[PDB]
Amino acid sequence: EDICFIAGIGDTNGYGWGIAKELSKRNVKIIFGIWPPVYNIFMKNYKNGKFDNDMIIDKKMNILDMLPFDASFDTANDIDEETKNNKRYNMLQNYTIEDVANLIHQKYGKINMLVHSLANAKEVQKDLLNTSRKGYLDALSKSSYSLISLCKYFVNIMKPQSSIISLTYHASQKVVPGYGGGMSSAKAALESDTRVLAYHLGRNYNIRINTISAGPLKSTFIDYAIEYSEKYAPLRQKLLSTDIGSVASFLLSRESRAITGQTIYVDNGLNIMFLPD
Amino acid sequence: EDICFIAGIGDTNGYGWGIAKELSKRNVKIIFGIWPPVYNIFMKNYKNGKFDNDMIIDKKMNILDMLPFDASFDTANDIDEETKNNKRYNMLQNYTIEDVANLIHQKYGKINMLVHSLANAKEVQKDLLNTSRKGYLDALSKSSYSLISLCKYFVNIMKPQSSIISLTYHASQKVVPGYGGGMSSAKAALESDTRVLAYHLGRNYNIRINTISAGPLKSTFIDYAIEYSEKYAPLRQKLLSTDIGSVASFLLSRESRAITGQTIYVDNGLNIMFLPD
Amino acid sequence: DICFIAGIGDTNGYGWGIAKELSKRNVKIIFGIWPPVYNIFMKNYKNGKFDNDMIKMNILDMLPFDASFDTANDIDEETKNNKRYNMLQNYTIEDVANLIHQKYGKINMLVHSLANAKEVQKDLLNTSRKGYLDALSKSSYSLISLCKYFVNIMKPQSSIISLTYHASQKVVPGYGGGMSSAKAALESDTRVLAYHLGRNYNIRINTISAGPLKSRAATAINTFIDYAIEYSEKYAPLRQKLLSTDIGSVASFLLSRESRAITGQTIYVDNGLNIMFLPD
Amino acid sequence: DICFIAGIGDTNGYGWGIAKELSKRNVKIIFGIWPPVYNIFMKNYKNGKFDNDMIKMNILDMLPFDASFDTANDIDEETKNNKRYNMLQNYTIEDVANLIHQKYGKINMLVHSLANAKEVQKDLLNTSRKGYLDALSKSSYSLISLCKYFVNIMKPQSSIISLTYHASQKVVPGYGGGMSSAKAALESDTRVLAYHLGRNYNIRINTISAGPLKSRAATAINTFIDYAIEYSEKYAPLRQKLLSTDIGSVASFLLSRESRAITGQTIYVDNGLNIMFLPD
């Protein structure tokens, strides 16, 4: 009985979903953490059967639960009155990082797989030089610190030899004009933090953590990235969300017990190239 | 007539000073940017001649000016009332990043060298896993975004083929337990941002930017780092603030016109080692 | 699913651990064995020495294999006539490719699990040209050539792995003879190969940077491995003992279709030691 | 201040640009010249061809030098008797070391500015063992051996540099013959050497990863350099044209005492091209 919490899904079109699908093959029970502002929409679509085709594995994806989850709030203490008043949030509760860990632990006990699959930058459209302090720190808060806080709070509800992964992108290491707003900065911090966290979690809890540097998925510039990737990557096949999924599944399993602190590239090998051929 | 603004000095015991000294050999005019809370102390010591020995180059260090400078505020607009009221700040003015660029430009015209030499993390003593969101973002704000904002505002007051450097540390790339509070995260972001900035500044202004990854200088754990470095680094000599200074001088000169976006290690080669010998 | 494992000489190394793990997924294993140790390995197999170690493997075949030789024409007269090669046939790279293809058809998995350097005991500065080139020939070029001849007997979408060590990237004094150089070249060649193999053949290639394991080869170095192992178990983020099957299950994953979007990569399987700068 | 420059054959490469820049700081330059091009280089010197290019250099000496040979005993009979070596003496590595020491005493600067690969035109997968080993011997081992023999005729706190190319780290199709492999090994060897040289000799060693320059060697590759240059001038963060003196002033800095705390490093002098992932 393995249970994985996936923080950061909004539809079946991203990595979170591809990871849920592949894990389901291993009979892993899935819990979704969903950004409150799209939680109700997601529940509706799910109810209206919009995801039924997406859920087929002759095996059904076993979704144990779907919970509102906001990566920018650590505890009930951090909720500002403007979101308290806020339309969407008003009718939802217990969606802070610590609140969700308590809920899950209470309802289902300890888990052993954790997926951080979320990024947000309010100024992702502006290049770095034109990003505001507010926009930059928002990017870091939502995309980088959220990983640390996730680990801080979920470690108490995880079994020993548990495993954790996040998703990153090569803009951290090499220049991708157009990946702005401090998203590149956020990814660089996330990959560094993955190492620092791997040391602490490894020594203190025997828990592993790694990150997957993924190629482009259509989930503007994304159309460029995907086209360029499919033209110039070593491997011609289309990169599927389940290509990341099967890698994630392996990193979350005990088959990878000796791998931690790593950035693992799942991008058809595009990262290895220097000049177009 | 070359002029360099050095943001982030508080005494003659750090890299900023070593960089000022070496630049002075090249007859570069120096302007110091000093954290307001220690500005007056610094001025006093300077007046009381405490730095006279430190200033000798048979050449005097030519300090063109010394200005209060706070890396956490971008413009006059960002000054919160608590600092406005604040003792130290109350008797100082025009210390925001944009304010200082305007002052310098007004008093002295355009400059062609910029040094970012500052780091601060309010929770540097806590390890990453135990760092608060507030502490983490403060680290990023002061140590990383400050570089971007410095470039944003000083580029308008710099000549073409100007040059910029900052200071970083290898904890960004490899684990150094004890370098906490998100300082490691901040350095990783700074090294990544150095590349992104190098592209923008290079293409749009023909300005270069690089960062120096420095070994330990006594400016607790620092005593460990220095001892370990002196035991295990390829080069036995003591690492001097002027070892960083002479490298900085070269990176800021036109002798390095074809180098940009780089992290340059000035650490007696310690970075190259895996296991102690 | 058939895998050729090039470079196994006993049950104490990574090759055996890889064999073991691939067997679990019902992969057919073919051993390529260096002729100097070929006979003794055979003898121990039939005399059931490895029986405790195979806990049961599916060993399709065991062939003489020397990665120094690309084709039969490359075998020098002395080696040809040597006591231990006497006496043996079809052990070059081209020859084992052909032989394997005749017996079994096309395969889909390849493991390069070998390395050799005559002067490993010398530090780099003191290595001769001859010793250095030997290291690169046996440890690095052998991979390139293995690929060249096996790509024709491999299907799409097959997978190739090799084994490397972090001394290529960071200084490990005592890892001498140009072995550091050979691992650096091999990690670079893995990228270049991943490009050509991916484009032209839809074949994948990656390399595993393993942590210390007390193997035959590891002892060839003048207690270095004992210190290595002991240091890793003390300072690695993960303090479990590193097993050859830890690498093996990672090898199995890389060779399987589950890793179809990974290529050209150096993957560290070393309890995380590589991420550390300063000892604790 | 005396610098030996190993690997100059005309005024169109990095060696010349390095010579030029070192002259500016009043450094005494000794050229080591490959015997195949030794005579013509001499002839052009006295016939004032390079006069426009030396705008005045301080050329202390010009010696025959072949980095394929470690000692006189390494010279094969054919080479020994060849039309172009006929006729020449003391051109091995040990021999030039000794010769330079006798004429001038100890030096404090060394530049490895050479590379060679018989099969550069072939892609890696199609390179023979012989071609690959040639690339590593001439381009990589030559540095190690240069160090071995020159450390005895160098003072503390002397400095050594070599030249490399980013194809070691990222795939550049067309950079064949094992040249990519040779650059990867050389960048690794630079670290290992920096350790031994720093500890035992207080001598520094670094390598410069240069951008494209239309040199003799660069054209040996089957328009590749023209595309390289054109691509760099279009996509590099800095759009100025990359000059051999751009590398030269960086070489001068690395060789001088101003860089006393830098060692084991790969320093990119390439208008920043290396930092880019996606074309504009």
Ligand SMILES: NC(=O)c1ccc[n+]([C@@H]2O[C@H](COP(=O)([O-])OP(=O)(O)OC[C@H]3O[C@@H](n4cnc5c(N)ncnc54)[C@H](O)[C@@H]3O)[C@@H](O)[C@H]2O)c1
């Ligand atoms: N798609 C790509 O080409 C690509 C490439 C590399 C990395 N990634 C990474 O993959 C991860 C998943 O993104 P994706 O591409 O699958 O798109 P996605 O929309 O499937 O995933 C991002 C999800 O994060 C959620 N989210 C946003 N703000 C949040 C908050 N404050 N709290 C909680 N959740 C929030 C959103 O609902 C969104 O669904 C991201 O971390 C992204 O950086 C994506």
Ligand SMILES: NC(=O)c1ccc[n+]([C@@H]2O[C@H](COP(=O)([O-])OP(=O)(O)OC[C@H]3O[C@@H](n4cnc5c(N)ncnc54)[C@H](O)[C@@H]3O)[C@@H](O)[C@H]2O)c1
């Ligand atoms: N000393 C080392 O061992 C070492 C190693 C690697 C990198 N570095 C880097 O070198 C740089 C200089 O630090 P140092 O070691 O010379 O110590 P330092 O005290 O000389 O430099 C840091 C200075 O930044 C100033 N500062 C702090 N908060 C500020 C703010 N909000 N606005 C403006 N200025 C502020 C302080 O007055 C302080 O003097 C830092 O960026 C540090 O990260 C130091």
Ligand SMILES: NC(=O)c1ccc[n+]([C@@H]2O[C@H](COP(=O)([O-])OP(=O)(O)OC[C@H]3O[C@@H](n4cnc5c(N)ncnc54)[C@H](O)[C@@H]3O)[C@@H](O)[C@H]2O)c1
């Ligand atoms: N043991 C470690 O700590 C360690 C760490 C990192 C990487 N590696 C790598 O793992 C691989 C396997 O080494 P190991 O540690 O398992 O030792 P091992 O002795 O078990 O494996 C090496 C095998 O290669 C064979 N071999 C040597 N030269 C050959 C040739 N010319 N032709 C064919 N076969 C030849 C030998 O017979 C030997 O059995 C090597 O590439 C090694 O560099 C080992």
Ligand SMILES: NC(=O)c1ccc[n+]([C@@H]2O[C@H](COP(=O)([O-])OP(=O)(O)OC[C@H]3O[C@@H](n4cnc5c(N)ncnc54)[C@H](O)[C@@H]3O)[C@@H](O)[C@H]2O)c1
């Ligand atoms: N040109 C470029 O675009 C470029 C880019 C990056 C790195 N580099 C490197 O710079 C260095 C110099 O190359 P270059 O581009 O200036 O070409 P070049 O032809 O000017 O320099 C190479 C020189 O090395 C000499 N040489 C070759 N084999 C030799 C041997 N066995 N003994 C002694 N001398 C020998 C040749 O006579 C030749 O003059 C090389 O290491 C090269 O890899 C060049």
Ligand SMILES: Oc1cc(Cc2ccccn2)ccc1Oc1ccc(Cl)cc1Cl
């Ligand atoms: O983080 C992401 C990275 C890439 C890679 C990419 C896509 C297109 C062009 C260049 N790079 C694509 C999508 C990504 O998703 C996001 C982007 C911005 C934000 Cl604010 C949030 C997400 Cl989830």
Ligand SMILES: Oc1cc(Cc2ccccn2)ccc1Oc1ccc(Cl)cc1Cl
């Ligand atoms: O940023 C710094 C890095 C090192 C390197 C080091 C020193 C000691 C032990 C380990 N690493 C030493 C001092 C540093 O200065 C700072 C550290 C924390 C802060 Cl909050 C600010 C500064 Cl300027």
Ligand SMILES: Oc1cc(Cc2ccccn2)ccc1Oc1ccc(Cl)cc1Cl
């Ligand atoms: O690549 C290898 C790495 C280690 C780990 C190690 C060895 C020595 C010191 C520290 N760690 C052990 C053996 C390795 O492979 C070899 C190296 C040289 C030779 Cl000659 C043979 C082999 Cl199989």
Ligand SMILES: Oc1cc(Cc2ccccn2)ccc1Oc1ccc(Cl)cc1Cl
């Ligand atoms: O290391 C080198 C790099 C470049 C730049 C380049 C060459 C080809 C394609 C793209 N860029 C040109 C020449 C280089 O050196 C050599 C490579 C092979 C040989 Cl045989 C000789 C030399 Cl000097």
